[PDB]
Ligand binder design. Structure first.
Ligand SMILES: CC(C)(COP(=O)(O)OP(=O)(O)OC[C@H]1O[C@@H](n2cnc3c(N)ncnc32)[C@H](O)[C@@H]1OP(=O)(O)O)[C@@H](O)C(=O)NCCC(=O)NCCS
Lengths: 15, 163
């Protein structure tokens, strides 16, 4: 990790 | 015409153009993600990206994941299809191709953190909120966030995923 997990963000795909 | 290839970060002009395009699709479709963050994972050594290539040149979508081979599970980092190509069945064909690939890679579980709409989306793709995979297997390898819903998909050794 310096930046690292393998991860998302979709918070309500309705924008 | 449509191809689902595993994009390797091998330092070549060709693949590095495709990875950047995929990365730009990711930040466009995932506004809540710090862009430098997407860059770090997509171009790190531990990650791989399976992309949807229109013809033999244009990226229209893909999935960035990280395999934890010894443990036999993989985490999905990012998934997306470019705007003008959504709602054409590509995203689902991608996931099916991915599962088929992971099955051939001897991966037993797919893990992914989801939020809001994404939970319902992954449920449709076969992921569940309850895990049949023991905690201690991912603990220490995959970060444990309280703010996110961790979902898993069991990849049975001989179920036909993908088509
Ligand atoms: C999630 C995603 C990959 C799906 O790819 P796709 O090519 O559009 O997928 P499909 O066409 O196979 O999806 C089929 C269904 O998803 C729905 N869908 C796809 N894109 C959508 C959008 N932008 N808004 C609302 N619904 C959408 C369709 O209505 C369709 O109907 P159904 O659920 O009854 O079957 C795509 O919407 C995307 O890039 N989203 C933004 C990134 C994101 O949130 N990714 C997941 C978390 S990192």
């Amino acid at each position: 990790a310096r930046k690292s997990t393998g991860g998302k963000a979709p918070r309500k795909q309705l924008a | 015409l449509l191809d689902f290839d595993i994009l390797t970060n091998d330092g070549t002009h060709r693949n590095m153009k495709l990875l950047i395009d995929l990365k730009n699709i990711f930040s466009r479709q995932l506004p809540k993600m710090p862009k430098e963050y997407i860059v770090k994972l997509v171009f790190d050594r531990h990650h791989e990206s399976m992309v949807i290539l229109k013809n033999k040149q244009k990226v229209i979508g893909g999935i960035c994941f990280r395999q934890y081979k010894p443990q036999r599970f993989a985490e999905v980092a990012f998934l997306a299809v470019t705007a003008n190509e959504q709602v054409r069945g590509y995203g689902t064909r991608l996931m099916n191709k991915f599962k088929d690939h992971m099955q051939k890679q001897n991966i037993e579980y797919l893990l992914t953190y989801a939020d809001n709409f994404a939970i319902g989306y992954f449920k449709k793709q076969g992921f569940t909120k309850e895990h049949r995979m023991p905690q201690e297997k991912w603990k220490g390898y995959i970060k444990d966030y309280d703010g996110g819903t961790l979902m898993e998909c069991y990849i049975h050794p001989y179920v036909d995923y993908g088509r």
